[PDB]
């Protein structure tokens, strides 16, 4: 087959039927695009970004700069500095409204509670916030001091890059710079420079993408995990089901589907409810199940269990298309992306209903529109609920032929930084012990999309993932590729026999997988605490460090901004495909062969599964030869 | 030569001299792209968002959708928006910096004052603010609450919209849902909406684009414009010498370019100085003196006399690199956009020094970084007169020959509301009254850029001025589009000439031009206001007033954000070049024939001034029929 599918026989099974049904879907259109791609924008060196536009760069005919004046390197950086931007609004939504919520649950308008309260106050009293009254009073100070950090101008100095940050990067920061104001301020700050006649200076902009990934860490991904484990629990490492065979076609089946996990976890408070399952039942189903999906599905899976009502997660965002085509999904309730805006048509043939429950989330042919706020998610989860039992009862039962794929596996979902301590005895020099002594040749965070660009969804993750492992290197996963693990069976205790032999051991002697599913590409800033923690307690740089990070099959810029925050963190950062920079030689040299110089990290290319992990391998060594271990 | 170059003799003149320097300049650039434009761009329906593109919509080789599933529509506007999150956040950052600039003039660390401190009170009353105490204490409240405005989030009332909107669109924006948040919130939402699988609804996405153009006008660009109002004065009519031979060589010549005009009012004030002056003697010059370019230039016109210090403005942006051309200027100082990126080796060529003033402005060879700070904006410019000097006696003083055109021309700068109130002795309503009996058949709002998409510079906005005056329609202009009427003559009282019979001799006998410069495409806001007082006398809705908006050489989304505020405020918006949607039919259709039945608003299209003219008249004479008159 010339079409790129999925590594996943789920997949396909269902891509049969979407095929047979002679619906449009994303594997199929890849197809027609290949017929007229341009290289132009292949290799970044093409610009739409004002009237006199739009531009290529070809020397050959004379078109060396674009009207403006702008060179291919300015040109290349400056579209990815403004598609970063997106990427940095995402995580800074999702930040706001995680503190937004906090509060209105500490005042008693959501379903919601302080559950993990010796989190909310140690955080207060890292931060030297007033911890005197009750956890409410501590929740709303926290909050307000987070949006305080969300917000915070070039000039005023932030609190959560000193305590979470390891001392020997800040003298880095410091020197070349890069410490960022607030991500609002950050965000709006790259974009005004991308504007045209602003900044055309690639290496500005791209100094601009590092700052936007520190702000991005610093000022929203570790502030909002953290304040969603005070409201949910922080994760420890459980057993949970995923893959598209965990759906039974006779019950009432409730999918979320985004990053935010607050509507997920309002409706499985629901459907715990006597009165649904009583109104499930009563419509002819055997119950009613939520399911969750892609980074709100993990987000669940890495704090709660799986039970009579919540089943699991689905798999990435390249799943939901083949998910509807199960004909066993009553609703899809949308918060962010993905969220793949032809969906329309399939859930009106396999008799599935949208709702959207963002107000950023909209696409032709969507039923419902709850957009959330913290004091109507109650209400709103019970909405979706109602919602699902009419559709239940009139679109799908006795109409649709469900086709289930049969495969399910099993993942231990939940490791967190304390679930590792806990793991070695509450102390990181067991890992450390380990590491110098070479069992484990170094960790890879592994924090990625998918993508139909350089493989079948899929492809390269599992297989560079399997590479790295059977090197003896240690994987904690998040994002979309996470899922993608688990799925393939990487994340469970059976995959220790896929590990070489010194991984293989200290996996057994711990009791883990060699892949540790720590969640989204959200908790990047929470991977950043385990390496800091190696750091501090080695007393080495980052960039010293034998690690390395992997997007193998990217997708968007809340991979790139992962990227660029891991580049200013100074480590090895391959990134596959390649982004639209190619066409770009002083850009290209910046960022692979320059940067080790100035950040410490570098990008890293390629999506050979072997090759990579060979590079990946080859630098860790060098770390550690220069360790002397 | 066959290259496009400028309707300005001046212009022409100097891009005789960068062609036979062989240097690259905007218009000769021009030409290679012309031989490689993509068509997919062109008409908007190409798309880089993500890695599975880039993509291309052609349905005659089966690409109907892009790889994620979007239609031409919503990815057209999708582009548009994301554009345009960069026109919103140069209005708010230049916003932001007026607000602190405005404080720490109040706490008296700057070298400005509160000039208008009626503005400042009656803005303080208008918006119920604390007006005890000094004028500086109420300085500091209302830079506090105009900060606010910017970081209101989408659940918070606005204040600015309910004081500066007129009753009947704040029920229309009402009933359709489209109050926005402040703009900081509203740009990073509209950003998070564009990334992949978000949002791709085209209607949503322009619902976006008029609530982002709401955010810009109410939430940015009205209080920036009254807060430097209030620090540098109301504008008031008066004479100003325009156009490129306002130079003379024998002086030390100091360029301020950008859109934030702080820099350059520091410049005045630091070179009126006498041991300033001296030191300029000293060097071998006759004095020293400063010069305004594009939107920072025309700011100070509108507030400030030309004197023996200050002599004018220069050009829009396509004048910058003739300008330099000149061989007259020592420091060109730059703030903002439009500093186009290659002006390096212009500056090297012809003796200049380059020193940018704020950190958005980056681009290869530039000289001298000052990044502005209200508490430093004083040492700043003693710095960059002290570099001046030192350029001229090393780099330009005997070794450049000069090459200063011929051509200046006088411009009646200034008009401000307050002026138009005052010229017509105190009220709108003998405008009104005018207006009702025919002899200005309505009024037009020109905001607009310049570029070379469709025409040689300035073509198309002054000839379609000439035709609309003709028509006796008034134009109340800004932009670089009123730096090219300036320029070409027709904001003088000789211009009455150019005027129709009902408007020349309403000019004559008010004694103002048919063309009112009214500053910036950053005082469109302020434009509506002219607008607001217009519905409120006629006590009818914006959109059935005689009116119209035209940016008839847009170039980027400065001019787009005012058009999208336009179309939301409910204006015919008339848009040349041609945005990059017109590839997407359902977009077009709402956008130039269902907005009319949704806000009241419209986008017309066209690039031939007589046609463009011929359908303006035939709106405002619709509308006129509609009232009666
Ligand atoms: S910003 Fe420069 S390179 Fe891009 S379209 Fe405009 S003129 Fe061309
Ligand atoms: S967002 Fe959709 S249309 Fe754009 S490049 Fe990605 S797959 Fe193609
Ligand atoms: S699709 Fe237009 S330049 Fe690539
Ligand atoms: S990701
Ligand atoms: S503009």
Same mark, same amino acid.
């Given at each position: 087959m010339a079409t790129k599918t999925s590594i996943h026989p789920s997949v396909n099974?269902?891509? #049969?039927?979407?095929?047979?049904? #002679?619906?449009?879907n994303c594997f199929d259109r890849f197809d027609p695009q290949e017929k007229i791609r341009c290289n132009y924008c292949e290799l970044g060196v093409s610009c739409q970004l004002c009237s006199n536009g739009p531009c290529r760069i070809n020397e050959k005919v004379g078109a060396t700069l674009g009207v403006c004046g702008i060179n291919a390197d300015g040109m290349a950086m400056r579209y990815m500095l403004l598609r970063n931007v997106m990427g940095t609004s995402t995580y800074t939504y999702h930040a706001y409204e995680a503190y937004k919520t906090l509060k209105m649950t500490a005042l008693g308008n959501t379903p919601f509670t302080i559950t993990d309260k010796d989190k909310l106050y140690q955080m207060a009293k890292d931060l030297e916030l007033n911890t005197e009254g009750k956890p409410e009073d501590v929740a709303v100070r926290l909050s307000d001091f987070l949006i305080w950090e969300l917000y915070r101008d070039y000039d005023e100095p932030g609190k959560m890059i000193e305590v979470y940050a390891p001392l020997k990067r800040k003298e880095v920061w410091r020197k070349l710079g890069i410490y960022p104001a607030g991500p609002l301020h950050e965000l709006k700050d790259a974009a005004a420079s991308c504007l045209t006649n602003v900044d055309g200076d690639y290496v500005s902009l791209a100094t601009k993408g590092?700052?936007?990934?520190?702000?991005?860490?610093?000022?929203?991904?570790?502030?909002?995990?953290? %304040? #969603?484990?005070?409201?949910?629990?922080?994760?420890?490492?459980?057993?949970?089901?995923?893959?598209?065979?965990?759906?039974?076609?006779?019950?009432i089946n409730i999918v979320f589907n985004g990053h935010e996990p607050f509507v997920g976890v309002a409706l499985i408070l629901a459907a715990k409810e006597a009165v649904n399952q009583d109104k499930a039942k009563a419509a002819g189903a055997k119950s009613?199940?939520?399911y969750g999906s892609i980074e709100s599905g993990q987000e669940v899976v890495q704090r709660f269990q799986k039970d009579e009502v919540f089943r699991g997660l689905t798999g990435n965002w390249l799943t939901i298309e083949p998910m509807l085509a199960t004909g066993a999904v009553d609703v899809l309730a949308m918060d962010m992306n993905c969220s793949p805006p032809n969906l329309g048509p399939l859930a009106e043939k396999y008799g599935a209903t949208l709702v959207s429950v963002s107000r950023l989330v909209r696409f032709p042919g969507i039923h419902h529109f709850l957009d959330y706020k913290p004091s109507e998610v109650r209400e709103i989860a019970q909405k979706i609920i109602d919602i699902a039992v009419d559709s239940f009862k009139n679109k799908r039962h006795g109409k649709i032929t469900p086709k289930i794929p049969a495969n399910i596996q099993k993942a231990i979902t939940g490791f967190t930084p304390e679930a590792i301590l806990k793991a070695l005895g509450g102390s990181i020099n067991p890992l450390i012990e380990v590491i110098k002594a070479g069992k484990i040749k170094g960790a890879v965070g592994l924090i990625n999309c998918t993508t139909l660009k350089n493989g079948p969804q899929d492809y390269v993750t599992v297989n560079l993932a399997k590479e790295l492992i059977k090197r003896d290197i240690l994987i904690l996963s998040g994002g979309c590729g996470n899922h993608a693990l688990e799925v393939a069976g990487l994340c469970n205790l059976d995959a220790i026999n896929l590990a070489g032999p010194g991984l293989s051991e200290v996996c057994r002697n711990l009791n883990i997988p060699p892949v540790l599913s720590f969640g989204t590409c959200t908790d990047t800033g929470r991977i950043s605490l385990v390496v800091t923690a190696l750091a501090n307690a080695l007393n080495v740089d980052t960039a010293?460090?034998? %690690?390395? %990070?992997?997007?193998?099959?990217?997708?968007? #810029?809340?991979?790139?901004?992962?990227?660029?925050?891991?580049?200013?963190?100074?480590?090895?950062?391959? %990134?596959?495909?390649?982004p639209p920079v190619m066409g770009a030689p002083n850009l290209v040299k910046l960022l692979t062969r320059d940067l080790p110089s100035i950040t410490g990290g570098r990008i890293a290319v390629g999506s050979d599964p072997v090759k990579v992990a060979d590079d990946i391998l080859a630098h860790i060594n060098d770390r550690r030869a220069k360790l002397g271990i």
């Open positions: 099974e269902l891509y #049969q039927r979407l095929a047979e049904d #002679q619906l449009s590092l700052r936007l990934g520190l702000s991005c860490i610093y000022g929203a991904q570790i502030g909002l995990e953290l %304040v #969603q484990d005070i409201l949910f629990g922080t994760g420890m490492p459980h057993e949970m089901d995923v893959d598209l065979g965990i759906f039974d076609a006779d019950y009613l199940r939520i010293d460090l034998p %690690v390395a %990070v992997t997007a193998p099959m990217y997708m968007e #810029q809340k991979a790139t901004i992962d990227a660029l925050f891991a580049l200013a963190y100074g480590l090895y950062t391959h %990134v596959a495909p390649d």
